[PDB]
Design a protein around this ligand. Sequence first.
Ligand SMILES: c1cnc2c(c1)ccc1cccnc12
Length: 330
Amino acid sequence: STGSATTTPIDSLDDAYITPVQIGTPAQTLNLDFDTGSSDLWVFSSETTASEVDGQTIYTPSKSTTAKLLSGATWSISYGDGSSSSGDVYTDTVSVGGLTVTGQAVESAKKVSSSFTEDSTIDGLLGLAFSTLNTVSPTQQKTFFDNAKASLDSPVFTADLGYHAPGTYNFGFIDTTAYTGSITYTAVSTKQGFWEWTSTGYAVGSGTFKSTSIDGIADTGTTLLYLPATVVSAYWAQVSGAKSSSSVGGYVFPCSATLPSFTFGVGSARIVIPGDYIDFGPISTGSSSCFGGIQSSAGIGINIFGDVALKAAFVVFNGATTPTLGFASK
Ligand SMILES: c1cnc2c(c1)ccc1cccnc12
């Protein structure tokens, strides 16, 4: 079997992408944030604290004839950006673009942190990292991809995120018309539960490629590209007026600047992120200072190849016996 769904930026900056997911019987369509950096499928629901719900679509397990409460199971997650959510668990039928999984654990939220409430366009998350990171206690649950894998034509899913445009998540197949040239595959470590790989280096604009190993995770659930301070300083040094702002929380640059591109290595292959992909607009409404799309990972503890990097490429999340990552230009 296969599945194919359109993914859409939530706003004019591509802060995040949402993909419609059908849950339950009859179907309840919720727009979820597909996240290759986490492994919980959680949704805003009829059980979410009323004051923590602001415009999101909710899952009502009592209205699904296939919904079954998973006895004694609870979940609680805390994300890298400080956000959090928790609740109880149901098992239900979940479909993504024609691909169906019965008995999928659907984590129903009782509490969500303020930033989830503040984002009315994201109805919950669909975790696509390895199931070893799933937070369901006392019995850990599998991801949608893990549950579907054996049924898929090929044990893979692809991320094809658009820059200011719609894109696609495909499951079970590789759309050979969605990229140019060939897909270069690279080794993945699953030790931390992430799609963790090693970039062979980088270049800034038309500058010399620097061969250096950058261990990081392919994360669709993180907006920006988080890289070592040495690499990030080398990037922003090419932008007139750019500086690291302690008050803003990162590198900022004059909104009138035209940003250089950023190339990252995948083996001997190169993915070029165009400069416009690195502009995250004014730091505050009406400001002429803009926020950068490449930021230091010094505070996080891990390098993150978030949407800024991934949207420049066609990305294969290969769930073969030995999982690997594939990248192609497009
Ligand atoms: C991800 C993280 N931080 C940001 C954005 C996206 C977009 C704009 C912005 C403006 C000021 C500070 N941070 C951000």
